Amino acid sequence: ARLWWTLDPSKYYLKQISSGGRNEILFTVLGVTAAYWYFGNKRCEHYWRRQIDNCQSWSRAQNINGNNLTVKQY
Amino acid sequence: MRRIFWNFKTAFVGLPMFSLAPKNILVYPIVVGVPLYTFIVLQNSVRGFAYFDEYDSDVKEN
Amino acid sequence: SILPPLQYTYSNEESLELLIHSIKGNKDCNSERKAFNLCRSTVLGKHVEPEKCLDKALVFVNCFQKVRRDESAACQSAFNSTLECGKKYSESTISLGSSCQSQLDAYLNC
Amino acid sequence: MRTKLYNAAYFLLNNNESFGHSFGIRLKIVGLNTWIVGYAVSRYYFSSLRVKAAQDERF
Amino acid sequence: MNHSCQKVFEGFVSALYDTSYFFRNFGPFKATIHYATYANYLAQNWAPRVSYIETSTPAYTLAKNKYAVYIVYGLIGGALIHNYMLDNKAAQKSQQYYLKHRD
Amino acid sequence: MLDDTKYIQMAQKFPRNVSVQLNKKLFVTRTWFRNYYFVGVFGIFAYFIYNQPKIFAPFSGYPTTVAYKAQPDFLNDQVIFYSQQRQNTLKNF
Amino acid sequence: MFKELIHIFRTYYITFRYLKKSNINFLKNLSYTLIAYYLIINFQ
Amino acid sequence: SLVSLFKNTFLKSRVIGLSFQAQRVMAQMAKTDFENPDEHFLLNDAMKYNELVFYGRLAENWSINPELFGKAELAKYNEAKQTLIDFNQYHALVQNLHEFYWELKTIYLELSRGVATSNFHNKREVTHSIIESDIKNSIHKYIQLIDDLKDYPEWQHKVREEIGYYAHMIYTSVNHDGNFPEIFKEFNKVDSLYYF
Amino acid sequence: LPIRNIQFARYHYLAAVTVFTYFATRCCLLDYKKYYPLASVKK
Ligand SMILES: CCCCCCCCCCCCCCCCCC(=O)OC[C@H](COP(=O)([O-])OCC(O)COP(=O)([O-])OC[C@@H](COC(=O)CCCCCCCCCCCCCCCCC)OC(=O)CCCCCCCCCCCCCCCCC)OC(=O)CCCCCCCCCCCCCCCCC
Ligand SMILES: CCCCCCCCCCCCCCCCCC(=O)OC[C@H](COP(=O)([O-])OCC(O)COP(=O)([O-])OC[C@@H](COC(=O)CCCCCCCCCCCCCCCCC)OC(=O)CCCCCCCCCCCCCCCCC)OC(=O)CCCCCCCCCCCCCCCCC
Ligand SMILES: CCCCCCCCCCCCCCCCCC(=O)OC[C@H](COP(=O)([O-])OCC(O)COP(=O)([O-])OC[C@@H](COC(=O)CCCCCCCCCCCCCCCCC)OC(=O)CCCCCCCCCCCCCCCCC)OC(=O)CCCCCCCCCCCCCCCCC
Ligand SMILES: CCCCCCCCCCCCCCCCCC(=O)OC[C@H](COP(=O)([O-])OCC(O)COP(=O)([O-])OC[C@@H](COC(=O)CCCCCCCCCCCCCCCCC)OC(=O)CCCCCCCCCCCCCCCCC)OC(=O)CCCCCCCCCCCCCCCCC
Ligand SMILES: CCCCCCCCCCCCCCCCCC(=O)OC[C@H](COP(=O)([O-])OCC(O)COP(=O)([O-])OC[C@@H](COC(=O)CCCCCCCCCCCCCCCCC)OC(=O)CCCCCCCCCCCCCCCCC)OC(=O)CCCCCCCCCCCCCCCCC
Ligand SMILES: CCCCCCCCCCCCCCCCCC(=O)OC[C@H](COP(=O)([O-])OCC[N+](C)(C)C)OC(=O)CCCCCCCCCCCCCCCCC
Ligand SMILES: CCCCCCCCCCCCCCCCCC(=O)OC[C@H](COP(=O)(O)OCCN)OC(=O)CCCCCCCCCCCCCCCCC
Structure with missing residues (x-):
């Protein structure tokens, strides 16, 4: 059998762009900005929460037809 | 009528396959998984395989 | 977010006090707790007619209150030592070290 | 047109050390990869199972 | 196969071939496919990267191409650590606010 | 340098009116073998990647849930329900 | 790795011979995209 | 017209830059076989191949604004545009030949699956009529193609060596009885002697 | 010939493979429901 395992990068994808190295910083800036936005939203939603349980938290239920939900004691 | 010519006991595809x-097939599975699986299972049980009973198992209704 | 929201905001001091008192109570009054849980397990005792459990519940609560109110001087001293150790452990943002198990064992034996 | 036929070589060749030595390595790698993929599939399958239901329950 | 089924099968495969050919070679569809193929090629073979073949003498290689990896690592690590610190600050702020509001 | 003379000549001088008719049946057969090996082989891998997270991380796909409270209606033998919207969150770790 | 899996399937399965190098490349691109999506999503 | 300036600059840059590469890409495509003519570009190195394929359409279709072009620059752009159109036609020709090759290879693959040792479920002693007709018509088209390439000895030789290989394998897959003399009548003239 | 940041590429590929395998197989996050019958109890 032939040995083929290796961690080295393939030369097919190792080319540079004409003006220099590949667009690494430009894409990393976008990635960092997107991560900042996403994690900021997640943190804001997560931390500023409380559960308030009282009569005003309950409303009258209804069917998908909009009528009030009541089930008989059949 | 398909006629097959085959040395069952000496051909490379025969009993030698059962022996080989x-x-x-089980070389890497055994030698890697068994130590790896043992490590993964035991590292939790540094103190023991104790089930901290969150429900009253010893309590039986009168 | 998937983590449940909080209902009652406990101060860190209050949280540690209640936690230590709870650990003590599970030793002092496990009998009342077990009886209450047994009576609250059945359908009739849990949803339909919870009042049949009320008396048992009361007893349990009383026991817990008695634990929450450290009556013995030795109990108070041990609880204060354990609570101070817990506060120091919690406030330590630097790499944490020794545990507060010794003080807890001292308190549970009071 | 009667299609031609042949006698598969591996059915009529005396077993040799070269076949064994090379196919051993190939089977080692095949077993490793198959074991990994099958473990993944097994975890997926078992996690896909439903929860136990009551006795004589409809819906 | 039976020659009647042969007629049916030939007609069906001809219809499939014609449908595929029309859909691929229709003006707007052809333009869409032609642009999307190149977009896919750009994405797959020219994705952002940190390792690349250096064919230039040290005098003819920019500094950006010698410290891009370090800049990327700095950006990512700083983002992660700053998000962690922001999470801790938000935890403290929320705790203090809801404590001072009641209990 | 490789002696690509003949290939260079082939590239420079190629016919511009020669074409071959394609048997539709064989083209379709090959393409449907390709579809068979896509849907039924790569489809397994694609569906695993798409779904396995949805099996091991279900809570992130169902954000809002509903809760109910009930009261009796003795004089009509009915049951009255009050609904409530909640954020589907973990519970009893 | 992917290359090796494709090579084994091509060399052992007669039916798999039907696929062009272009179709293999399309599968390669789709698999890479799915792997990137999997890595990203698991952490979300 | 700023947008016109940018459009024309983009077109000029891409088209002229690729025109200097069209020779290399076309030569490489010729070098490989017809099974996967773009094999080298997919596996080893994409020497501005996908770029040529994409920008050929733009060269053919997108308009030009001569007032934004010089004299020698405009002549060079027209030359490059013609080169890209030539590449478009060359790619179309190679694609046609490659698809015909795959037709023949499909026929051969069906035969091989027929005679495969693992084929314990679909073993057929006698070739059926449908595949015989397919073989006959495919060989007829191949002979017509060889005739049509009489002015291009290199192309004719490549078409033989590449496509006729599977015709020869099909020839070898079956016995010389039944309709065999009629099916391979055209093949027996010259091609059969070549593949011996 | 020289490849910029080759070692970084090797380690990134290794990390990607490790993470993908970890999440796909969940090798580290086993299930212990099968061991519960074979475990002692406290309290
Ligand atoms: C961000 C949010 C918005 C995103 C919107 C995306 C929209 C995409 C629409 C695409 C439409 C079809 C396009 C057809 C091609 C037309 C353009 C063209 O031919 O190229 C011209 C131009 C030059 O091409 P070329 O001359 O042929 O050069 C190549 C040659 O080999 C010659 O090479 P060379 O050596 O001469 O060098 C030339 C160099 C020249 O290149 C450049 O100059 C471009 C450099 C980068 C941009 C620089 C400018 C930055 C500032 C822009 C500011 C814009 C402001 C806009 C304001 C708008 C206000 C309204 O070329 C390159 O290096 C090409 C770069 C290719 C980059 C590909 C990126 C792939 C990955 C993307 C996703 C990454 C996710 C990571 C997540 C990881 C998380 C862990 O290239 C480009 O325009 C590049 C575009 C690349 C991206 C297109 C595809 C994006 C798809 C994203 C994934 C979305 C998936 C969603 C699911 C799917 C269903 C929806
Ligand atoms: C020819 C006919 C053959 C017929 C065979 C019929 C077989 C029927 C099987 C029925 C199902 C058995 C399931 C066993 C589950 C075991 C795990 C378990 O208890 O989990 C609890 C399970 C929950 O699972 P979980 O915890 O979420 O995850 C389980 C995972 O396995 C993860 O758990 P873990 O993390 O603890 O995993 C342990 C770790 C352990 O891994 C290791 O460390 C590996 C160690 C290997 C050591 C081996 C040593 C051998 C020594 C060799 C020595 C050779 C010397 C030679 C010398 C030569 C001379 C020098 O990983 C593994 O166990 C690896 C598994 C992956 C397998 C990869 C290969 C898959 C493809 C190949 C399959 C076999 C093909 C054979 C073809 C034969 C052709 C002739 O829940 C239960 O309580 C279920 C209990 C099991 C019953 C399930 C019933 C389902 C019924 C479905 C309906 C249809 C049934 C159809 C039946 C048909 C019958 C004919
Ligand atoms: C529970 C969850 C759900 C599970 C099911 C999920 C299914 C997902 C979709 C699968 C889609 C598969 C089809 C698309 C892929 C490409 C197929 C293809 O090439 O198309 C043309 C090709 C036919 O080509 P052909 O020209 O007609 O054949 C002549 C060529 O020379 C032939 O040349 P060749 O080299 O191309 O042909 C080799 C051919 C293989 O085809 C053959 O040539 C022969 C196939 C039959 C072989 C039967 C065994 C022969 C004797 C061996 C010794 C057995 C000993 C057992 C007892 C041991 C006792 C100790 O290989 C394949 O089929 C490639 C893919 C195979 C794996 C994927 C399919 C797995 C199906 C598993 C369930 C099957 C149904 C239940 C069976 C059990 C019921 C109790 O395949 C087909 O059209 C048939 C497809 C397969 C049908 C099922 C046959 C049984 C397979 C059992 C495999 C078990 C593996 C172990 C793990 C199983 C875990 C579930
Ligand atoms: C849900 C999420 C969605 C978004 C994410 C998507 C992610 C997945 C990827 C999707 C990929 C597939 C996309 C769908 C296929 C679209 C096919 C198509 O366009 O069909 C046209 C195509 C007809 O065009 P044709 O046959 O190729 O051309 C001959 C015609 O006679 C026409 O001849 P003509 O000369 O009269 O007109 C030529 C030109 C109109 O000509 C003009 O007026 C000039 C256009 C711009 C030329 C390039 C100037 C670049 C200047 C530098 C910019 C630098 C920016 C900053 C960065 C600097 C540092 C690098 O019209 C086109 O052909 C437009 C094609 C699309 C844009 C091509 C330009 C690419 C480069 C510029 C954009 C990318 C940024 C590159 C930056 C870096 C550059 C180095 O076929 C159709 O008519 C099909 C219609 C039905 C299908 C849907 C049509 C959708 C139309 C969308 C228009 C979008 C315009 C751009 C918006 C930009 C917003 C920021
Ligand atoms: C219709 C169009 C056509 C559709 C076709 C169908 C398929 C879809 C196609 C769509 C097109 C895009 C497809 C995805 C890209 C595929 C790339 C590919 O296949 O490349 C293979 C190719 C394989 O090559 P290879 O030879 O095998 O080598 C690979 C090795 O891994 C070698 O890798 P490497 O070594 O070069 O590394 C790569 C590099 C890549 O990374 C980057 O540079 C990128 C960075 C992230 C940028 C993210 C930008 C995202 C922007 C998004 C903006 C919003 C978009 C919204 C769009 C909406 C719609 C318009 O990695 C790094 O930079 C490593 C960073 C590690 C950081 C470590 C942190 C350390 C912290 C500690 C610091 C030190 C502390 C010391 C303390 C000491 C205490 C004592 O990959 C590459 O070579 C490129 C690198 C890999 C890039 C992966 C990018 C994946 C992006 C997925 C995006 C999915 C978006 C879905 C959106 C859905 C919306 C609904
Ligand atoms: C849920 C479903 C599970 C079902 C499990 C089924 C398991 C199937 C395991 C199959 C193993 C591999 C062989 C079949 C597939 C081969 C695919 C392939 O590429 O091969 C092509 C090749 C054959 O094709 P070829 O050799 O012509 O090669 C192709 C060449 N050209 C292209 C020129 C045509 O290999 C084979 O098919 C070899 C077959 C060997 C068969 C060996 C049979 C052994 C039987 C042992 C029985 C033991 C009984 C013991 C009883 C004891 C009682 C006490
Ligand atoms: C090596 C190459 C091949 C590799 C292949 C790899 C495949 C990867 C597949 C990935 C996707 C995995 C999907 C898993 C779905 C499993 C569904 C299943 O059958 O689960 C078992 C299920 C009962 O499970 P459950 O209801 O949860 O009850 C137990 C709860 N404790 O069982 C049931 O409910 C039983 C009814 C459903 C199942 C019906 C199956 C019908 C099969 C018909 C076969 C027809 C062909 C026959 C051929 C031979 C003919 C002679």
């Missing part, structure tokens, strides 16, 4: 394949 099982001991070579």
